[PDB]
Paper text:
We first used X-ray crystallography to determine the structures of bacterially expressed AncSR2-LBD in complex with progesterone and with 11-deoxycorticosterone (DOC), at 2.75 and 2.82 Å resolution, respectively. The structures reveal why AncSR2 did not yet distinguish between progestagens and corticosteroids, which differ only in that the latter contain a 21-hydroxyl. The two protein backbones have nearly identical topologies (RMSD = 0.28 Å), and there are virtually no differences in the ways the ligands are bound. The AncSR2-progesterone complex contains ample room to accommodate the additional 21-hydroxyl of corticosteroids. Further, Asn35 offers a perfectly positioned hydrogen bond partner, which is unpaired in the AncSR2-progesterone complex, for DOC's hydroxyl. This additional favorable interaction explains why AncSR2 not only accommodates corticosteroids but is even more sensitive to them than progestagens. AncSR2 does not distinguish strongly between progestagens and corticosteroids because it has only a weak preference for steroids with a 21-hydroxyl. Taken together, these data indicate that the promiscuous responses of both AncSR1 and AncSR2 to non-target ligands are due in large part to unfilled volume in the internal cavity and untapped potential of polar side chains to form hydrogen bonds with polar atoms on the ligand.
SRs are hormone-activated nuclear transcription factors with distinct specificities for endogenous steroid hormones and exogenous substances. In all SRs, the activating hormone binds in an internal cavity within a well-conserved ligand binding domain (LBD), causing the LBD to change conformation, attract coactivator proteins, and increase transcription of target genes. AncSR1 is the last common ancestral protein from which the entire SR family descends by a series of gene duplications; AncSR2 is the ancestral protein of all naSRs. In contrast, AncSR2 was completely unresponsive to estrogens (and cholesterol) but strongly activated by low concentrations of diverse nonaromatized steroid hormones, including progestagens and corticosteroids and – to a lesser extent – androgens.
Author numbering: -1 to 246
The structure:
């Protein structure tokens, strides 16, 4: 038989981005958030590259490709970050990158404190659930495929199939470990529930994101160029209520 989606997914998994951050410079809500954004630009590149590698994704109309990316990019980055914070700090600290890890001081200095907390609860779940790589890779894959424009998609049928497949491979991945039916079931539930709770958080995140974006010169937070492009193109569709979370 052919190499599984997970085999491919483990292969196309992006390397960890460094922020470029200076940790000697003091913790100032403007410096922090500017720095975060630089990173989001660094990640956005790795994410899109990632999505192009992602089996079936190239087979969607370019309209859909860019839209999905436009909607899911925030959740993708927050989730991967939930994952990293789990592996590297076991949920205690927010591990944006090896050179830019938030602790308590910096979550406070962030002026997003309640959102940090939320992202943390996400990593803490990763921890509670002892999520595995393979569950993670498939979850993240589904996370992309979990916020679609309400007016439908060019490639609709092909997408629904992809979604199907990534649920199927999330199933292959929970099934490893044995347990049989019932345990599996609760698992599937918990994971997908974790996925579904993602939208919630992304909500607050986009919200504060836009907020910070509009008021950028007001707040002295430096959004880089690719970041300008993407947030901008996302913003009006999002407000319009074009984007609709797919749930379980
Ligand atoms: C109807 C509600 C739901 C979400 C709301 C928006 C969000 O708050 C984010 C955004 C922050 C900026 O600062 C300027 C205000 C802006 C555009 C809000 C305007 C408006 O009230 C919206 C569309
Ligand atoms: C976009 C954002 C800065 C960048 C991060 C995001 C939260 C999660 C996140 C994960 C990453 O590992 C990279 C950057 C990023 C996407 C923040 C949510 C609010 C904050 C701002 O709105 C300030 O720009």
């Amino acid at each position: 038989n052919a190499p599984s989606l997970i085999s491919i997914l483990q292969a196309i998994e992006p390397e960890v981005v460094y922020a470029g951050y200076d940790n000697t410079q003091p913790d100032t809500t403007n410096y922090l958030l500017s720095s975060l954004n630089r990173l989001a630009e660094k990640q956005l590149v790795s994410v899109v590259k990632w999505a192009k590698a992602l089996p079936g994704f190239r087979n969607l109309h370019l309209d859909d490709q860019m839209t999905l990316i436009q909607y899911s990019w925030m959740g993708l980055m927050a989730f991967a970050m939930g994952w990293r914070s789990y592996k590297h700090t076991n949920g205690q600290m927010l591990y944006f990158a090896p050179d830019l890890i938030f602790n308590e001081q910096r979550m406070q200095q962030s002026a997003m404190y309640d959102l940090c907390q939320g992202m943390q609860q996400i990593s803490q779940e990763f921890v509670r659930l002892q999520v595995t790589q393979e569950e993670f890779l498939c979850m993240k894959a589904l996370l992309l495929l979990s916020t679609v424009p309400k007016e439908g998609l060019k490639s609709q049928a092909s997408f629904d199939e992809m979604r199907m497949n990534y649920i199927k491979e999330l199933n292959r991945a929970i099934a490893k470990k044995e347990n049989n039916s019932a345990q599996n079931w609760q698992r599937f539930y918990q994971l997908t529930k974790l996925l579904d709770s993602m939208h919630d958080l992304v909500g607050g995140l986009l919200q504060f994101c836009f907020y910070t974006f509009v008021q950028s010169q007001a707040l002295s937070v430096e959004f880089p160029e690719m970041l300008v492009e993407i947030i901008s193109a996302q913003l009006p569709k999002v407000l319009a209520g074009m984007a609709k979370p797919l749930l379980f």
